Amino acid sequence: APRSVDWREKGYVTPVKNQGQCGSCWAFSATGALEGQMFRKTGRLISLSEQNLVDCSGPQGNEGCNGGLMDYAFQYVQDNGGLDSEESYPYEATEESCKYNPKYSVANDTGFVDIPKQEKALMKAVATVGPISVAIDAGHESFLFYKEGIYFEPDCSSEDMDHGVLVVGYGFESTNNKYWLVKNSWGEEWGMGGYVKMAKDRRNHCGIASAASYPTV
Numbered sequence: 001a002p003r004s005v006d007w008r009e010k011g012y013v014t015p016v017k018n019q020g021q022c023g024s025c026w027a028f029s030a031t032g033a034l035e036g037q038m039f040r041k042t043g044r045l046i047s048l049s050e051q052n053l054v055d056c057s058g059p060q061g062n063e064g065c066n067g068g069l070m071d072y073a074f075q076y077v078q079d080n081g082g083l084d085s086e087e088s089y090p091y092e093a094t095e096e097s098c099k100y101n102p103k104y105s106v107a108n109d110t111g112f113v114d115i116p117k118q119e120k121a122l123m124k125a126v127a128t129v130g131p132i133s134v135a136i137d138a139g140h141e142s143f144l145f146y147k148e149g150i151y152f153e154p155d156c157s158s159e160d161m162d163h164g165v166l167v168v169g170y171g172f173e174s175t176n177n178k179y180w181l182v183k184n185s186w187g188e189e190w191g192m193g194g195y196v197k198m199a200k201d202r203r204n205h206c207g208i209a210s211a212a213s214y215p216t217v
């Protein structure tokens with residue numbers, strides 16, 4: 001694994017999105033991972049529809065704005081045989097009837113990989129695959145009102161995750177304090193342009209390696 005990685009610079013990552021007042025972070029984490037994998041497959045970066053996932057992936061166990069999981073989203077795309085573009089199926093921030101139309105499918109997957117629950121394994125995955133879906137303990141106001149710098153919350157749990165986000169890289173700063181570069185779905189005004197630097201190799205801080213996965217294509 002290289003000492004740092006940033007898949008934004010290689011064209012794998014769409015702009016930061018905003019889930020609004022809906023428990024759909026899992027859909028944004030899953031679309032971000034599949035956007036990366038489709039880009040590596042095809043060389044085309046196409047924003048994918050979280051609304052398609054929120055409306056349609058109930059059979060796989062998702063609950064719309066009442067939560068869900070990225071692996072359930074990857075399973076839906078496999079079962080469905082496709083996923084629409086964000087342009088064809090824009091985000092509404094409420095669960096509505098399923099409107100998937102295969103004519104506008106721009107992505108597919110063949111299942112998913114669950115990464116071993118270790119930050120070394122996560123680093124190898126990020127370096128060899130692309131952006132990776134992860135779950136973190138985001139349930140402290142220090143995270144809600146994060147602005148900049150390496151996020152380190154002594155009270156964070158490595159087992160009690162409550163938010164899904166996307167690891168787009170890792171690196172270190174000199175101020176060797178290491179971090180994961182994490183894309184959130186709270187809009188560009190949160191954090192650093194919508195990103196957070198999460199402490200890396202600090203005893204699986206906030207559980208970032210505990211439920212990491214990505215779709216196969």
Ligand SMILES: *C(=[N-])c1nc(N2CCOCC2)nc(N(Cc2cnccn2)C2CCCC2)n1
Nearest residue numbers: 023024025026065066067068135161162163164
């Ligand atoms: C992301 N917006 C989000 N939202 C929720 N909820 C809780 C259910 O009501 C809606 C808001 N949950 C999650 N979860 C799933 C979760 C949360 N806490 C306990 C167990 N699962 C995250 C999705 C990836 C793993 C955690 N996210």
